[PDB]
Ligand binder design. Structure first.
Ligand code: HEM
Ligand code: HEM
Ligand code: HEM
Ligand code: HEM
Lengths: 311, 311, 311, 311, 311, 311
C-alpha cells in the first residue's frame, strides 16, 4: 500500500472518510488557482498525514469532463464524459454538478477533516463545495442496511487490473474513472422486510455475508445485476469504497457509493442493469429502499498527469 | 471507570461523541413514552455497547426543568431551572429549547451513531430532535482553535467531588447538573492573530499547553475568567467534555461545550464572568471568535432516580 | 478491574478463556497437594500474567461440595451442594463430576494455556482433568448460534451485588457460587429456522441484539425464562461469561456456559424454568438446539478463604 | 503482503491458525464438489475476511498427488508425489492420508474457525476431515519446547525465491509444495535436560535465540541438520509457519510443522538428514522429544491454476 | 488506576519511565521555588499528560529528609531519615545525595521526557539534577539479567496495604517511603554462569519465571533474602517498579531499583539481608553481578500534604 | 515495506531508533571480525526481530570510505569519500570519525537496544563505539524545536528513486550514501523567538506544518536552502529519518540528522547551502540554534554487496 502518495486508488477500506465535491469558478484566475492546488496536492496530504505515524491518510483527486476541457483542451482520456443520467421504470439516477472530487480516507476523522480544511482554505473563492459527506465504518464492514458492503471487491493485482488504465490508453496509464452517488435509505420500509426478503434483495446472507446459492439467487438481486460477464465468460469488476453517513434528526441514513474502474463502461453497465433492469423492467430491488441524490463522474489522473495540470 | 452503566458522568475523554437534544411532545402518552425509554436506557446502552469488547460506550441522560416538572412534580433537585440567558456588552448566551439530553461517547463513531439510532427509534413521535452534533477528537486533545482543550479538568475523586451531588441534596445524591452550548468559530478572524495574541486570549501556551505565568496572564483570558475562587481561597471546578465538529462546505468550525457540576451556581458564575466580564465589561476574548448558538441546562439523575422516572 | 488477583469474579469479557474441571485423588497426600496448589494460586497467576504488560490474565478457582467437605469439614458456605440434575419433559441437565474448577481468562490464548500448563504440572498425580475447553470470542461478542451473548449481564456494583456473597453469610463474604454446563449445538437444525423464528427462540433480534417488544416476546423465549422477578418486583441477575468452542471435524459447535451468583438459588431457578418449563412443559426453545454434556456447581472462596485452605 | 487473496504463501506469522486436512470421496460428484469449492475459495475467504478491517485472514489450499491425478490427469507439476515415509534408526516419519489442505491464518481465532466452518459446510459429504489443528502463537514467537521458532525463515524476495515455482516448471509458476507433520512432545523428558543441553539439541541459545558459535554447534543439532548447502556453496531455504497446539488433559503438547518450498527435494533432504542422520545414524536430537503423528505432501497451485480446477 | 493525579504510587508497570533526582539550592528563594513547583505538580502533569487520550502519564514526587526539615520543620512523617549506608562483607550500598525525586511513567518516552523538561525548566537555578535515568521495558517484563522482574509485586488492595501509610501515622495517611538505587551489571561475569546457576542466584526459573521448589531454593537467593516474615508468620511486601537502562558504548547495562513501602523498615531489612547477609555473611548473589551506584530515601507525601508544601 | 531484511533504507518512521557509529581496529584480525559481523548481519537482525510479531525491527549498515578501502580495494562506489567539513561564515560542520554505522529502528526501544547489544558483543575488541544515540519520536512527528520533522520526505517509488543507486553505478545498484550529524540545540535562545520568527527560520507554520506562501518564504529559511532545483527545473530529494534525543541534567536537547541519497552530491549541496549560504553568507537560520557535533559519510551497500564483504 502506498504511503502519503496522491492518487492512491488501491488503498484498503478505512475507519473514516471524507468525500468532497466542488464546482470551480468560471474565471481564468479561478482555473489557475484550482490547478495550482490540485497539481500540488502532495503538499497538504503530507502536511497533515505525516503527523500520524501509521501514515493512513490518502487523497484521490478526480476532475470532471467539463473542467478537464478547460485545462487540458488538447489531451483527454478516451472515455471522459459527464455522468449519463438514467431514467428507469421506477427509479432514476440523476447527473449532478461537480468539477473536482477529493476522496480522502484515514484511520481517524480528524486527519480527514483537517486535510479537507486545508484544501478548502487553499482553494478559497476559486471553488465552491456542492457535496460533502463524512463517512464512517459501521460495525464489521457493514452499510446501514445491515449488510457487509465491499466483500467481493477485487484486491491487489486484480484491483489494479480492474481500476487502473493500462495499455489501451497509454497517455493516461495509471489513471482511473470514478463515479459517486450519494444514497439515502428508507429505513422504515427496509426494516418491514424479513431477513430472508432482504437477503433476496441483496443476493447474500445478512449476518454471515455468504452469496446465495445459484438456485436461490434472484435475477434482480443486487449481486446478479452487478455481475458483469463478457461474451468470453470473463468477469469485470469495479473497486468500491462505500461508507455510511447520516443525521438522526433528519432521519437521514445514507450509503455513499464510490466506484473506480479503468473504463467507465463497466460501472455504467452496472448502473443500467440496476436502474433500467435486465431484462428491461427487472431492476435492482436495493433501489426500492435507496434513492440517489447525486451522480457525478470524474477522471482520476495518475500522479504524473495530476502534477502537470495547469502547465 | 464504569462499564455500560447509564449516568456515568466521570468517564474520560473519548475519540467520538454524540450530543442529542430533544423536545418531548405535549401529550400524556408522549410523556409516558419518554419516561419508559429513559428509565430503561440501560437496555439500548448494553444492546449496542456489549458488541465492543472494550465496552467504551457511555450514555448520560439529562432532563430539563420544564419536563422534570411534568414527570416528578413533588420531588425536585435543589437547583434545577431553565438555562438563564446572558446579555453581555458585546456577546450573548441564548437559552434554547431542550427537554432531554443524551451525551453519548465511545471509541468509535458507529457505536455512538447506532445507540442514537436505537434511542430515536424507541422515542418515535414522542420526541423531536432539536440539536444534534457528532463530535470528534482533534489531534492531541485540541479544539479547532488549535489549543489543547480539557487540560485542567478535575479527575478521579476531584471529579466526583466537583460534578456529583452529595450530602447537600441527599434525595438526589449522585446526580449532576449539565449545561451545553454549541459554539461556532470565526476561523478567519482567529487566524489573523499571532500565536502570542491567541495565547493571551486563552491563558496558556498553544503548542505546549502550559498556563501563562502570573505576570503574563491577562485579567480577561479564558483561564482567568473561568477560575472560580471562594472567600476561603478554595477553588471550584467543573467537569468539561468538549468536542470538535463542523462542515467545510458551510464554513462551520465548532466547539461543542458540555460542562457538569454538582451545583449549576459554579457553571453559571463562569458563564457570567465570560459573557458579562469581571469587572463588568472585561469579558472573555474567546467570545470575540466564538458564538453560542444554543444554551440549555439539564438535571442528570443518578441511575436510581433515572430508573424511577415515570412511576 | 483487579490486576493479577485470584478469585476476580467481576472481570469483563475476554478474547480467550480456559475452563478446566478436575477430580481430586482420594488420598490424604492428594488432598494436601490440591490445597497447596489452590491456596497459593497467586504464584502461577503472577508467574504467567506478569509477563504481559496489560495484566489481562485472571484465574478463578471453584471447589466442589464433596471436596469442600474433605478439607473444611467444620465451616461451609450456606448453600454449597452438588449440582442438582434436572429431568425435563424433553431435555435434561446432567450432574457430572468435578472437585476443582479453574476459570482462566486473558487477552491471548498463550497466557491461558501456559497458566493451565503450570497448574496441571503443579497438581501432578493429585488431580485428573475431566473437562477442558479453550474458549474463544466469536465476532462482536456472539455465540455460535449467531446471537450476541452476554448483553444483559450486570456490571460494576450491580455485578458485585448479584455475584458476591454479602451480609447474609458473613463468614464467606466475597465468595460466589458458580455453575458450568458445556453445551453442544445442532447447527443444521438451527440454521433450518428463519431469522425471525430464531429471534423468538432467544427473545432478542439477531443482528441488532435488541430485546423483543413485550407484545412480541414469547413466554418460552430464553430471555423470558431467564428473567427472575421476586414478589416485590425486584429482579435478580447472574453474571455469565460464556465462550464459543468447537471442532470442525467432529461437527462440534459449542457454547460453554458459566454463571456466577451470590446464591445458587437464582441460577437453579433459571435452570428449572429452562429445562422444566414455566408453566411446567413450557421449556426453553434454546434446548431444542443445545444439549448440556456437563453440569457442575462450585463454591468460589474469597481470596482470604482460598489462602486458608488446607490449614 | 497480499490482501484476501487465495494461495498467499508468503504471509508473515500470525497469532492464530487452522490446519485442516481432508480426504475426498471416491465419486465423480464428490470430485466435482471438491473442485467447485476449492476453485472458488476466494468466495468464503472474502465472506469472512472482509469483516475485519485489517484483512489479516489468509487461506492456502494444497492438493495431494492422488487427488491431483483424478482432476488434472494431463498436466502435473514436475515434483508432485505422495509424502515419502522415512524409517530412521530410532525415529520414523509416517506418510498419512490427505487429499486437501487448508492452511488458514489470521489475527484472531474466530476468523480462522469461521472460514473453516464455511469451507466444511460447503464441502458437505464430499470430503472428510482427517486432521485438524487450531494453532496459537506462544509468547515471543516460541514453540512449546520454549525456543523461538521461525527465526531463520527467508523473507520478502528470498521467501519468494525459496517457496515459489519459477522458470524451471513454467506451467506451474507461482505454485509451491508444502509438507505438514503434526508433532507431539515428551515435555517431561525435555524438561529433564539442562538449558545448555537443550541449546545443543536445537543449535541456538534459548532465551536469546542466537545461533551457537561454529565451535559449539553440534553436528546433530537441528540447525546443522536443517542447513542445506549445495556443491557451489549456495544455501537453500524453506518457508516454515509452525504453530503451537495442545490439550492439557491429554498431556498433548504439540508443534504443527508446515514447510513450503519451490521443490520438495529441499524439504525432503532436510527430513532425511533429521530422521536418517548425517552421517547415517547421526539423527536430529529434537526427534528424541518429538514424535510425528502425520506426514503429508501437497501441491499448492497458483491462483490461476486453482481457479481452473474441475474445468 | 488514577488518571493524571500526582502521587499515584499504585500504578501498574509501564513501557517507559524517567527517574530524576535533584538537589535543591541552599537559599530561601530556591526553597520557595522548589515548593512552588512541587506543590503545583498537577499543572505540568496535566499539561503534558492530557495530550495522550489514554492518560498513561504519572508523576510521583519524593522529598528527602534534609529538605523536608527545611520546609516542614514542625511536622514530619514518623520514619523519615536519610538512606542508611550499608557496608557488607563484600558489597556496599552507598548513601548518595538527593532532595527531590520525580518518578515519571508513561506508555511513551516522549511524554516522560517532556514532563521532565517542563519540571526542570520550572525549577531553573533552584535545583540541580544529580541522577537521571530514562528507563525502558525489556521484552516480557524482564531486567537486563534476563529474568522477569516484578512478578511477586503486591497488586490492588495488597499494594495499597503494603505501600501507603495508614492509621499508624494518621497525619501522613496516604503517603509512602521510597528508596532508589541505580545498579550497573557485570554482564560478562553473569553470562559465564549456566542458566541453572543464574536461577539459583535469583530464586526462580529463567524463561518460565516460576519460583524454585522449597528443596531447591538457596538460603542466599534473592527471593529468599527479600522474603520478609514476621513472628506471627505474616509476610511483608514492598512495591517495586524497576526498569532497564544503559549505554552500549560505555558497556553500561543497568537495573534502576525503586521500591515503595508504608514503613521503610521493610525495605531496609530487605537491604540488610541482601548486603549484610542472613546469617551474616550469607549475602545476595545478585550483588556479585550488580553494583549500586546510588542510594537515596524519600518521603512521598499524599496529594493533600504535597499541595500544602511551602505554605 | 521489507521484513527483517538488512539494508532496508526505505522503511517508514518509527517510534524508537538507535544510531551507532564505530571505528574498526587496525589489525587484519579486527578487519576480518568486522567483515564477518556485518556481512552476516541478517543473523542478529532476525534473532531479535523475529521475537516481535509485527517485525518492525530494521538495521541498515553503512561503511566509511577509509574502511571500505581496507576491505574492497579493487571495487568502490563512484562517490564514496570521507565527509567534507564545512567552515561557514558563522557555523561549521565538522568531519568526525566513523568506519561503521548501524541505523536501527523499531516500534520499541528494547528491540533496538537488544540488537545493538548483540552487535557490540559480536564485534568485541574489533571495533569501538564513538557515537551512540537512542532516538525517540516526539509527539506528532516533531523534533525538539517543536516542528513536524520529515514532512516533505519522498515516499514509495520517489523514495527509491531519490535514495538508491541505479543504472548510473550498476556494480552498486541498490546501495545508498548516508550522512549523519548529531545536533544539539540552544533551547533558551530558540524559545526567545516568537512563533512567527521560528516559522520564518524553518519555512513552515509550526502547529499546522504548512509550507509558507511564496511571498512569505525567506531566502534563508531551512526549506528554501534545502530545496534543490536543477537547470531543467527538476527537484532532487533526500530521504531523512531524524529523531529526538537528550539529557535533561546536561541541558542536552538534540536532533539526530540522518539523510540517505543515491548520490551524496545532493546532500552535500544542501549542507553547503545551509552552512555557507546562498548567496554566500545567507546561511540557514536553524544553525543559529543548532550545533553539529558530528559529521560522517557512509556507503550503504546493497544486501548482495554487504553479504560479499570480507570475501
Ligand atoms: C444504496 C447503494 C448500495 C448499497 C446499499 C449496496 C450494497 C451492496 C452489498 C451489501 C453488496 C454485497 C457485498 C459486496 O460484495 O460488496 C454489494 C455488492 C456489489 N455492489 Fe453494491 N451497493 C450499493 C450501490 C452500488 C452501485 C451504485 C453499484 C454499481 C455502480 C454497486 C456495485 C456493486 C458490485 C459490483 C458488487 C459486487 C457484486 C458481486 O460481484 O458479487 N453497488 N453492494
Ligand atoms: C468556544 C468555546 C470554548 C473554547 C474554545 C474553550 C477552550 C478552552 C481551552 C483551550 C482551555 C485551556 C485548557 C483547559 O484547561 O481545558 C479552557 C479551559 C477552561 N474552560 Fe473553556 N472553552 C470554551 C468554553 C467554555 C465555557 C462555556 C466554559 C464555562 C461555562 C468553560 C470553562 C473552562 C474552564 C473551567 C477551564 C479551566 C480553567 C482553569 O482552571 O485553568 N469553557 N477552555
Ligand atoms: C517438533 C518439530 C520441530 C521443532 C520443535 C522445530 C524447532 C525449530 C527451532 C527452535 C529452530 C530455530 C529457530 C529457527 O530458525 O526457526 C528451527 C529451525 C529450523 N527448522 Fe525446525 N523444528 C521442527 C521441525 C522441523 C522440520 C520437520 C523441518 C524440516 C522439514 C524443520 C526445518 C527447520 C529449518 C530449515 C530451520 C532453520 C535452520 C537454519 O538455517 O538456521 N524443522 N526449528
Ligand atoms: C538541527 C537539525 C535540523 C532540524 C531541526 C531540521 C528540521 C526540519 C524541519 C522542521 C523541516 C520541515 C518539515 C520537513 O519537510 O521535514 C525540515 C525540512 C527539510 N530538511 Fe531539515 N532539519 C535539520 C537538519 C537538516 C540537514 C542537515 C539537512 C540536509 C543535509 C536537512 C534537509 C532537509 C530537507 C531536504 C527538508 C525538506 C525541504 C523541502 O523540500 O520542503 N535538514 N527540516
Amino acid at each position: 500500500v502506498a504511503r502519503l502518495a496522491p492518487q492512491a486508488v488501491l488503498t484498503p477500506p478505512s475507519a473514516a472518510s471524507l468525500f468532497l465535491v466542488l464546482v470551480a469558478g468560471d474565471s481564468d484566475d479561478d482555473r489557475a488557482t484550482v490547478c495550482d492546488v490540485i497539481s500540488g496536492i502532495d503538499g497538504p496530504l503530507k502536511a497533515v498525514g505525516f503527523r500520524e505515524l501509521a501514515g493512513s491518510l490518502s487523497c484521490v483527486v478526480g476532475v470532471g469532463a467539463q473542467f478537464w476541457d478547460r485545462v487540458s483542451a488538447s489531451s483527454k482520456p478516451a472515455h471522459l464524459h459527464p455522468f449519463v443520467p438514467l431514467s428507469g421504470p421506477v427509479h432514476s439516477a440523476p447527473s449532478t454538478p461537480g468539477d473536482l472530487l477529493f476522496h480522502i480516507k484515514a484511520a481517524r476523522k480528524d486527519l480527514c477533516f483537517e486535510l479537507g480544511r486545508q484544501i478548502v482554505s487553499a482553494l478559497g473563492s476559486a471553488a465552491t463545495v456542492v457535496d460533502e459527506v463524512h463517512g464512517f465504518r459501521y460495525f464489521d464492514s457493514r452499510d446501514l442496511l445491515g449488510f457487509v458492503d465491499g466483500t467481493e471487491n477485487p484486491t491487489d493485482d486484480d484491483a489494479a487490473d480492474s481500476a487502473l488504465i493500462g495499455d489501451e490508453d497509454p497517455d493516461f496509464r495509471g489513471g482511473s474513472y470514478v463515479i459517486v452517488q450519494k444514497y439515502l435509505h428508507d429505513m422504515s420500509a427496509w426494516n418491514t422486510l424479513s431477513t430472508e426478503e432482504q437477503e433476496r434483495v441483496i443476493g447474500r446472507t445478512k449476518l454471515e455475508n455468504v452469496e446465495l446459492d445459484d438456485d436461490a439467487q434472484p435475477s434482480n438481486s443486487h449481486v446478479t445485476l452487478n455481475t458483469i460477464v463478457d461474451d468470453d465468460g470473463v468477469e469485470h469488476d469495479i473497486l468500491r469504497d462505500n461508507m455510511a453517513f447520516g443525521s438522526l434528526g433528519e432521519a437521514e441514513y445514507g450509503t455513499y457509493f464510490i466506484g473506480y474502474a479503468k473504463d467507465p463502461a463497466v460501472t455504467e453497465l452496472m448502473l443500467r442493469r440496476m436502474f433500467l433492469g435486465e431484462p428491461p423492467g427487472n431492476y435492482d430491488r436495493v433501489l426500492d429502499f435507496s434513492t440517489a441524490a447525486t451522480g457525478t463522474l470524474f477522471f482520476v489522473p495518475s500522479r504524473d498527469v495530476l502534477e502537470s495540470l495547469g502547465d
